Design an enzyme around this catalytic site. Sequence first.
Site, PDB file in Angstrom:
ATOM      1  N   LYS B  54       0.855  -1.179   0.000  1.00 21.00           N
ATOM      2  CA  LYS B  54       0.000   0.000   0.000  1.00 21.00           C
ATOM      3  C   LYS B  54       0.894   1.233   0.000  1.00 21.00           C
ATOM      4  O   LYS B  54       1.723   1.391   0.901  1.00 21.00           O
ATOM      5  CB  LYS B  54      -0.920  -0.009   1.219  1.00 21.00           C
ATOM      6  CG  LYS B  54      -1.821   1.199   1.347  1.00 21.00           C
ATOM      7  CD  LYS B  54      -2.856   0.916   2.421  1.00 21.00           C
ATOM      8  CE  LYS B  54      -3.899   1.999   2.521  1.00 21.00           C
ATOM      9  NZ  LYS B  54      -4.939   1.580   3.508  1.00 21.00           N
ATOM     10  N   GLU B 103      -0.196  -8.417   4.213  1.00 19.51           N
ATOM     11  CA  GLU B 103      -0.605  -9.724   3.719  1.00 19.51           C
ATOM     12  C   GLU B 103      -1.538  -9.549   2.524  1.00 19.51           C
ATOM     13  O   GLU B 103      -2.394  -8.654   2.505  1.00 19.51           O
ATOM     14  CB  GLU B 103      -1.300 -10.499   4.840  1.00 19.51           C
ATOM     15  CG  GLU B 103      -1.985 -11.774   4.393  1.00 19.51           C
ATOM     16  CD  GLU B 103      -2.544 -12.556   5.572  1.00 19.51           C
ATOM     17  OE1 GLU B 103      -2.625 -11.988   6.685  1.00 19.51           O
ATOM     18  OE2 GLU B 103      -2.914 -13.733   5.381  1.00 19.51           O
ATOM     19  N   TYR B 104      -1.340 -10.381   1.506  1.00 14.44           N
ATOM     20  CA  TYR B 104      -2.223 -10.415   0.346  1.00 14.44           C
ATOM     21  C   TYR B 104      -3.361 -11.396   0.605  1.00 14.44           C
ATOM     22  O   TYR B 104      -3.122 -12.594   0.794  1.00 14.44           O
ATOM     23  CB  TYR B 104      -1.437 -10.830  -0.904  1.00 14.44           C
ATOM     24  CG  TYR B 104      -2.294 -11.084  -2.123  1.00 14.44           C
ATOM     25  CD1 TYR B 104      -3.262 -10.167  -2.516  1.00 14.44           C
ATOM     26  CD2 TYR B 104      -2.124 -12.240  -2.897  1.00 14.44           C
ATOM     27  CE1 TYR B 104      -4.046 -10.393  -3.646  1.00 14.44           C
ATOM     28  CE2 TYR B 104      -2.916 -12.470  -4.021  1.00 14.44           C
ATOM     29  CZ  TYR B 104      -3.868 -11.532  -4.384  1.00 14.44           C
ATOM     30  OH  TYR B 104      -4.652 -11.738  -5.499  1.00 14.44           O
ATOM     31  N   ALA B 105      -4.594 -10.888   0.611  1.00 10.57           N
ATOM     32  CA  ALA B 105      -5.802 -11.690   0.754  1.00 10.57           C
ATOM     33  C   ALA B 105      -6.392 -11.854  -0.634  1.00 10.57           C
ATOM     34  O   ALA B 105      -7.009 -10.912  -1.146  1.00 10.57           O
ATOM     35  CB  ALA B 105      -6.811 -11.017   1.691  1.00 10.57           C
ATOM     36  N   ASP B 148     -14.449  -0.869  13.936  1.00  4.91           N
ATOM     37  CA  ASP B 148     -14.959  -0.604  12.587  1.00  4.91           C
ATOM     38  C   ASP B 148     -15.219  -1.910  11.841  1.00  4.91           C
ATOM     39  O   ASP B 148     -14.963  -2.026  10.638  1.00  4.91           O
ATOM     40  CB  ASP B 148     -14.000   0.298  11.802  1.00  4.91           C
ATOM     41  CG  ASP B 148     -14.630   0.884  10.530  1.00  4.91           C
ATOM     42  OD1 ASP B 148     -15.874   0.987  10.454  1.00  4.91           O
ATOM     43  OD2 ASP B 148     -13.868   1.236   9.600  1.00  4.91           O
ATOM     44  N   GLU B 152     -17.073  -4.812   4.468  1.00  3.12           N
ATOM     45  CA  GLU B 152     -16.038  -4.235   3.607  1.00  3.12           C
ATOM     46  C   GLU B 152     -14.650  -4.429   4.193  1.00  3.12           C
ATOM     47  O   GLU B 152     -13.654  -4.445   3.451  1.00  3.12           O
ATOM     48  CB  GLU B 152     -16.276  -2.729   3.404  1.00  3.12           C
ATOM     49  CG  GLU B 152     -17.393  -2.362   2.445  1.00  3.12           C
ATOM     50  CD  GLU B 152     -18.408  -1.407   3.066  1.00  3.12           C
ATOM     51  OE1 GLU B 152     -18.090  -0.231   3.308  1.00  3.12           O
ATOM     52  OE2 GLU B 152     -19.534  -1.861   3.358  1.00  3.12           O
ATOM     53  N   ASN B 153     -14.563  -4.570   5.515  1.00  2.93           N
ATOM     54  CA  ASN B 153     -13.294  -4.718   6.217  1.00  2.93           C
ATOM     55  C   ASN B 153     -12.962  -6.162   6.546  1.00  2.93           C
ATOM     56  O   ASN B 153     -12.083  -6.416   7.378  1.00  2.93           O
ATOM     57  CB  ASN B 153     -13.321  -3.891   7.501  1.00  2.93           C
ATOM     58  CG  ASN B 153     -13.246  -2.425   7.222  1.00  2.93           C
ATOM     59  OD1 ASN B 153     -12.800  -2.016   6.144  1.00  2.93           O
ATOM     60  ND2 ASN B 153     -13.679  -1.610   8.186  1.00  2.93           N
TER      61      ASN B 153
HETATM   62  N1  LIG Z   1      -3.672  -6.734   1.690  1.00  4.27           N
HETATM   63  C1  LIG Z   1      -4.646  -6.684   0.780  1.00  4.27           C
HETATM   64  N2  LIG Z   1      -4.899  -7.787   0.037  1.00  4.27           N
HETATM   65  C2  LIG Z   1      -5.863  -7.733  -0.886  1.00  4.27           C
HETATM   66  N3  LIG Z   1      -6.664  -6.713  -1.201  1.00  4.27           N
HETATM   67  C3  LIG Z   1      -6.391  -5.639  -0.451  1.00  4.27           C
HETATM   68  C4  LIG Z   1      -5.422  -5.538   0.534  1.00  4.27           C
HETATM   69  N4  LIG Z   1      -5.422  -4.273   1.099  1.00  4.27           N
HETATM   70  C5  LIG Z   1      -6.378  -3.645   0.456  1.00  4.27           C
HETATM   71  N5  LIG Z   1      -6.992  -4.403  -0.506  1.00  4.27           N
HETATM   72  C6  LIG Z   1      -8.112  -3.989  -1.345  1.00  4.27           C
HETATM   73  O1  LIG Z   1      -7.729  -2.843  -2.071  1.00  4.27           O
HETATM   74  C7  LIG Z   1      -8.728  -1.806  -1.991  1.00  4.27           C
HETATM   75  C8  LIG Z   1      -8.054  -0.528  -1.582  1.00  4.27           C
HETATM   76  O2  LIG Z   1      -7.522  -0.797  -0.272  1.00  4.27           O
HETATM   77  P1  LIG Z   1      -7.810   0.082   1.014  1.00  4.27           P
HETATM   78  O3  LIG Z   1      -6.532   0.150   1.750  1.00  4.27           O
HETATM   79  O4  LIG Z   1      -8.974  -0.455   1.853  1.00  4.27           O
HETATM   80  O5  LIG Z   1      -8.273   1.502   0.482  1.00  4.27           O
HETATM   81  P2  LIG Z   1      -8.620   2.563   1.567  1.00  4.27           P
HETATM   82  O6  LIG Z   1      -9.584   1.947   2.530  1.00  4.27           O
HETATM   83  O7  LIG Z   1      -9.263   3.830   0.930  1.00  4.27           O
HETATM   84  N6  LIG Z   1      -7.161   2.919   2.328  1.00  4.27           N
HETATM   85  P3  LIG Z   1      -7.073   4.429   3.095  1.00  4.27           P
HETATM   86  O8  LIG Z   1      -6.306   5.443   2.152  1.00  4.27           O
HETATM   87  O9  LIG Z   1      -6.255   4.265   4.436  1.00  4.27           O
HETATM   88  O10 LIG Z   1      -8.444   4.947   3.407  1.00  4.27           O
HETATM   89  C9  LIG Z   1      -9.801  -2.259  -1.000  1.00  4.27           C
HETATM   90  O11 LIG Z   1     -11.101  -2.318  -1.574  1.00  4.27           O
HETATM   91  C10 LIG Z   1      -9.332  -3.631  -0.492  1.00  4.27           C
HETATM   92  O12 LIG Z   1     -10.359  -4.610  -0.607  1.00  4.27           O
HETATM   93 MG   LIG Z   2      -4.669   3.741   5.775  1.00  7.56          MG
END
Ligand SMILES: Nc1ncnc2c1ncn2[C@@H]1O[C@H](COP(=O)(O)OP(=O)(O)NP(=O)(O)O)[C@@H](O)[C@H]1O
Ligand SMILES: [Mg+2]
Lengths: 277, 277
Positions: B54, B103-105, B148, B152-153
């Site tokens: 990220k 971690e990659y989910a 939270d 979605e989480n």
């Molecule tokens: N480790 C991960 N493995 C797989 N998918 C992920 C992972 N982290 C995030 N994602 C997906 O990628 C998308 C963007 O990630 P996310 O970090 O949730 O955006 P965000 O919530 O706007 N972050 P933020 O800038 O802190 O608000 C999300 O819809 C997640 O489902």
């Molecule tokens: Mg963040």
Amino acid sequence: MSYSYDAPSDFINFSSKRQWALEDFEIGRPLGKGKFGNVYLAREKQSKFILALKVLFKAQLEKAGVEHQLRREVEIQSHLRHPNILRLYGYFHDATRVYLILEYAPLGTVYRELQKLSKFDEQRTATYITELANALSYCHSKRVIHRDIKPENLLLGSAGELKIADFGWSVHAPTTLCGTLDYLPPEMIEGRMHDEKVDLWSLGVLCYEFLVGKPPFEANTYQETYKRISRVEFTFPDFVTEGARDLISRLLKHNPSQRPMLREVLEHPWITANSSK
Amino acid sequence: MSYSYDAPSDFINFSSKRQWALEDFEIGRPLGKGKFGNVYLAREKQSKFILALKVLFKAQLEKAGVEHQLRREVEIQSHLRHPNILRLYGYFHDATRVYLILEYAPLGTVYRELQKLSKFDEQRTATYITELANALSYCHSKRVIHRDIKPENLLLGSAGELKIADFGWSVHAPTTLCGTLDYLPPEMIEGRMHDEKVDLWSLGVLCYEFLVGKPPFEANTYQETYKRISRVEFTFPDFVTEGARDLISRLLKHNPSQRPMLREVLEHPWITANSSK
Ligand SMILES: Nc1ncnc2c1ncn2[C@@H]1O[C@H](COP(=O)(O)OP(=O)(O)NP(=O)(O)O)[C@@H](O)[C@H]1O
Ligand SMILES: [Mg+2]
Ligand SMILES: Nc1ncnc2c1ncn2[C@@H]1O[C@H](COP(=O)(O)OP(=O)(O)NP(=O)(O)O)[C@@H](O)[C@H]1O
Ligand SMILES: *SC[C@H](NC(=O)[C@H](O)c1ccc(C(F)(F)F)cc1)C(=O)NCc1ccccn1
Ligand SMILES: *SC[C@H](NC(=O)[C@H](O)c1ccc(C(F)(F)F)cc1)C(=O)NCc1ccccn1
Ligand SMILES: [Mg+2]
Ligand SMILES: [Mg+2]
Ligand SMILES: [Mg+2]
């Protein structure tokens, strides 16, 4: 453990890059003790400016698990600039200690003043409440809630004016969280301990203690004090006047949203009739 | 702002101190776009280990005033290690960006799974609630409250295991504050936003949404949703079985102290009758 805070560590020319060092200060008498160190009268050597140096021991902070609370305290307080808020000029640290460079408040605490006088007249009380409401209005302009206002945390400046201290419990309270209420419990939606109205209640308790010499919910056990607070059960001795009763009763509302705005305190007819400020 | 977090930045040999560098990673396809930067599929070059990176832009975090929220999220999540909590292996930063090594989910969100299937059967529901309760029990053993929890989480691992993600609202909630109740408002004594029972309510909402396909307090305005939550006003469709109703009703209590412990959820006879875990 990281002692890199978002707070100033730069040397200040008090007669008005280079970082603070312990050798910048002469140390004087200890001003008080805490669980994590002591506070000393001190003096910056180049300017001879008098201040207070709070010394905290890293090993004690880390053992108690309170190091991130100190970081937040320093970050919040060092960015507040108001004549009724105790200044935190900066901080520094060495291998064993964290140092907070504080404004020195020469006239002590309101706590000690209440011990000396038992209770305050209406003019001294209303003046204190104006200063506190001014400070808390500034805090709210910066989206800071103090949450630990009490007589031991009110210091006194050279003119006898209040200095709010101890930001150890404060929060900066300015979103996907609230975009969706469906999964939040009532207490997360309401966020009562994150509401600026937290400090309006303590303003009422203090106004009562200043006039009466004892806090309104005092009881000889914690559980009974909590019941009285929860039920808002308090009464006034005969001498408390109608205007003071109105202000205090308006402040001590169980529901934070029912408490008044700081402007309504500053403009309350009892405040304006008795405050010299 | 200071990007020195109390969180690991040490290079990790994934196939079994040097600090992470951007050159350690082959950045592959984007996995998603966040508010402050994207998440990319990546592999660490030495181990070929597959992970998610990220990338957040410091200028954007500071402009929005969310950088201390990121710091807390990183510090909290990077110290949690549980198979149903998304791992944060570490972080690092350069002149313009912060990098979270995650971690990659691979199997998306429970939110998407619910969109596809409309609702879950009792076996999948009880299994998911078991995994969530185990993960939250671990959190609470570390004095971490998530606050939270929502579909979605919840991400899905390659065997379909739930991974709790998004610690941006979590708190590490283990004094002189309580030493004197006399000056505290009711909401500061009770501390309901710092109570681990926050997460038990969300678990009940999830159990209902998993079985029904919509959350129990859903309404087409924010004010009506809050009103129904505040009154705990909801109904069960005829198809929700009595065993599920018992668990959900025990969880959805206005008074947080009336909500059960996580052990009681894991040991509920409807959970053990239906879970594959
Ligand atoms: N480790 C991960 N493995 C797989 N998918 C992920 C992972 N982290 C995030 N994602 C997906 O990628 C998308 C963007 O990630 P996310 O970090 O949730 O955006 P965000 O919530 O706007 N972050 P933020 O800038 O802190 O608000 C999300 O819809 C997640 O489902
Ligand atoms: Mg963040
Ligand atoms: N800037 C100051 N000027 C004058 N007196 C001070 C100052 N700071 C602290 N003191 C006094 O020194 C004593 C030690 O204060 P202090 O330890 O900061 O209380 P505290 O806010 O509870 N700190 P802590 O030990 O971390 O909980 C207090 O009783 C104060 O009255
Ligand atoms: S989320 C709904 C929102 N509530 C808040 O913003 C609440 O004060 C709050 C504050 C901080 C957090 C955090 F610490 F980040 F977790 C969480 C929640 C809201 O709309 N409040 C207004 C309101 C008014 C009347 C009833 C209910 N809500
Ligand atoms: S301060 C009295 C104390 N309350 C708490 O510990 C409460 O959970 C809490 C937690 C964190 C904060 C902070 F974030 F620091 F602001 C504040 C408050 C207590 O006495 N709790 C037990 C109790 C007694 C009576 C009723 C309810 N709870
Ligand atoms: Mg730190
Ligand atoms: Mg302190
Ligand atoms: Mg920072």
